[PDB]
Structure formats: structure tokens, C-alpha cells
């Protein structure tokens, strides 16, 4: 354990194993959309609610799925830290990748 000596620590958060968003989380995104607090990477609000979505292992960001294609576009990525309805997972998220 050298966290304080590690003056340069960074993880591939943009290349960690993507998963499918839980239902209780999914409704939280849509709730936040209708609430008008879901701002995409650009900072603009999202109005189109979704039925499928991808979630980071850290549960920090969400990606959009449309038609059938997982939309991995940065501008289509939502930050859960902005989702005032997002339910906590009580897990210590650790990924060496």
C-alpha cells in the first residue's frame, strides 16, 4: 500500500469491462431525463428516454443503446454523479484494468 507515494495513478476507466444497466438504475436515468438533469458529455440535457443502457464497472458512467446498436459515443455517455435518482451499490469498485 503506497497510495501517498503513488504521485501518478491512472486507470483505463474508458476501457474497463462494460456491463448491462440494472433496472433500478435504468429507471433512475429515465426519471432524471424527465426531471431534466441528465446532461451528456457536451453539457446539454437528454430528452429521449431509453430501454437499454450500458454501465461502467465503477458505476460512474452510462452509455446509450439504440435500435440494437450499443452507442459508445462519448457525447451519448451519461454521468451517474449527475443522476439525483441513482441508487448506491455499496460495493468497493476496484479494477486493475
Cα–Cα distance for residue pair 17/11, rounded to 1 Å = 12
> Which residue range(s) make up the domain with 82?
8-93
- 62 strand-pairing partners: 55, 78
The alpha carbon of 18 is separated from its chain's Cα centroid by a whole number of angstroms, namely 10
Residue 2 maps to a domain:
no
Cα-based angle 73, 15, 44 (whole degrees, multiple of 5): 30
In a domain, 16, yes or no: yes
Domain total of the chain: 1
Q: How far apart are CA 83 and CA 87, in angstroms?
A: 9
Triad 24, 62, 79: Cα angle to 5°: 100
Asked whether residue 3 is domain-assigned, the answer is no
Domain membership flag for residue 58? yes
Question: Within a domain: residue 22?
Answer: yes
Tell me if 43 is assigned to some domain: yes
Amino acid at each position: 500500500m503506497d497510495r501517498k507515494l503513488l504521485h501518478l495513478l491512472c486507470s483505463p476507466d474508458t476501457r474497463q469491462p462494460l456491463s448491462l444497466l440494472e433496472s433500478k438504475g435504468l429507471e433512475a436515468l429515465n426519471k432524471a431525463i424527465v426531471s431534466g438533469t441528465v446532461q451528456r458529455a457536451d453539457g446539454s440535457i437528454q430528452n429521449q428516454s431509453l430501454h437499454e443502457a450500458l454501465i461502467t464497472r465503477d458505476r460512474k458512467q452510462v452509455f446509450r443503446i439504440e435500435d440494437s446498436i450499443p452507442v459508445l459515443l462519448p457525447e451519448e455517455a451519461i454521468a451517474t454523479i449527475q443522476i439525483a435518482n441513482f441508487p448506491d451499490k455499496l460495493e468497493h469498485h476496484h479494477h486493475h484494468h
